Paper text:
Cytoplasmic dynein is a large homodimer that consists of a heavy chain (>500 kDa) and several smaller associated subunits, each present in two copies. The heavy chain ‘tail’ domain binds the associated subunits, which include the intermediate chain (IC), the light intermediate chain (LIC), and the light chains (LC): Tctex1, LC8, and LC7/roadblock. Interestingly, the C-terminal half of the protein is involved in binding Rab effectors, whereas the G domain is the docking site for the dynein heavy chain.
In this study, we report the crystal structure of the conserved N-terminal domain of the LIC from a thermophilic hyphal fungus, Chaetomium thermophilum, and show that it is composed of a canonical G protein fold. Like Ras, the prototype of small G proteins, LIC has six β-strands in the core of the structure (five parallel and one anti-parallel) as well as five similarly placed α-helices. In addition to the five-α-helices found in Ras, the LIC G domain has two-α-helical insertions (α-helix 3a and 4a) that extend from the core of the structure. The LIC G domain also has three additional α-helices at the C-terminus (α-helix 6, 7, and 8) that interact with the core G domain structure and has a short seventh β-strand that extends the β-sheet. Unusual for G proteins, the ‘P-loop’ and ‘switch 2’ of the C. thermophilum LIC G domain interact with one another; the side chain of Q60 in the P-loop hydrogen bonds with the main chain carbonyl of G54 and the side chain of T116 in switch 2. When the C. thermophilum LIC G domain was injected onto a C18 column for reverse-phase liquid chromatography (RPLC) with acetonitrile, no 260 nm adsorbing molecule eluted from the column, which is consistent with the lack of nucleotide in the crystal structure. Relatively few universally conserved residues are on the surface of the LIC G domain, with the exception of a hydrophobic groove of universally conserved residues composed of three aromatic residues (Y93, Y95 [β2], and Y113 [β3]) and Leu125 (α2) (residue numbers refer to the position in C. thermophilum LIC). In contrast, the other five double or triple mutations tested bound normally to the dynein heavy chain. These results indicate that the universally conserved hydrophobic groove on the LIC is involved in binding to the dynein heavy chain.
Numbering used by the authors: 44 to 73, 89 to 201, 211 to 345, 375 to 394
Write the structure that this text describes.
Amino acid sequence: RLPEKNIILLGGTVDSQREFFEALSSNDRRFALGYTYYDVLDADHEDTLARISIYTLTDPSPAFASLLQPILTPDSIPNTLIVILLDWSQPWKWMRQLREWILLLRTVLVSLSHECKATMEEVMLSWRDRGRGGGINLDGSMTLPLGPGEWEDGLGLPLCVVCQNAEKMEYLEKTQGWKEEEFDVVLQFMRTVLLKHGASLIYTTPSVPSQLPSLIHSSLGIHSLLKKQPLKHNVIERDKIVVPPNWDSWGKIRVLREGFDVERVSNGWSVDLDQPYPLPDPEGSTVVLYEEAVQDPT
């Protein structure tokens, strides 16, 4: 009888998915995809607001991706969030991993019924203003034209990217010589491509409290009857990044550090996503730009 919400959880490992689940549901909780769920409590830890179902796909398999079809119906689509897990142990892999998941996901979404696609268009239209500072809160409850890059590439569903094990940033600083400005460049690259999908970005560390529950629950359209504090965005304190939807812009991305060609990187992401799924990297690719900038210690 509870409102039902879905998370489609992509990537990670067995342990990092479980860590995601704990981080997500710690405070405010009471041939197949992995499955679990939990009941979300309101901010006083009393009343139950929604039941969140999580469907998990660790690897970008086309076979198992097909299992998403039955989960995405006209009724479920407006209640669904895509979450991609990335790992701070291997940030050099991020842009390529992200491209693969998005191409995979697109393959599923174009295959849904006309009614599903009409519903996804409705969802995308309504997301334009959610949490944008005008009339509409991030959670979809009520209270200027779009900058460049913003929502140029709506997926049909909202996306949240969660970069796990951020304690490994300190590891890269001390054993691989990474400087503050290298973490910032990663951030500029991620913010730029994700902006095109209207997507959020958040870094987490196991056992370190974060805004992950508030971000995910608000993105799922779960409306607190007690709390009106909005999300707190951060792009400065490097291991606690929080970039909520409809907050970022090229203007903001460009000032983090100098020398970042935001438009080139945004156009390179068009090059990357205009490709069949599932050999060589196309001219202008942002995966290539990223992988030149963020090198693998091989």
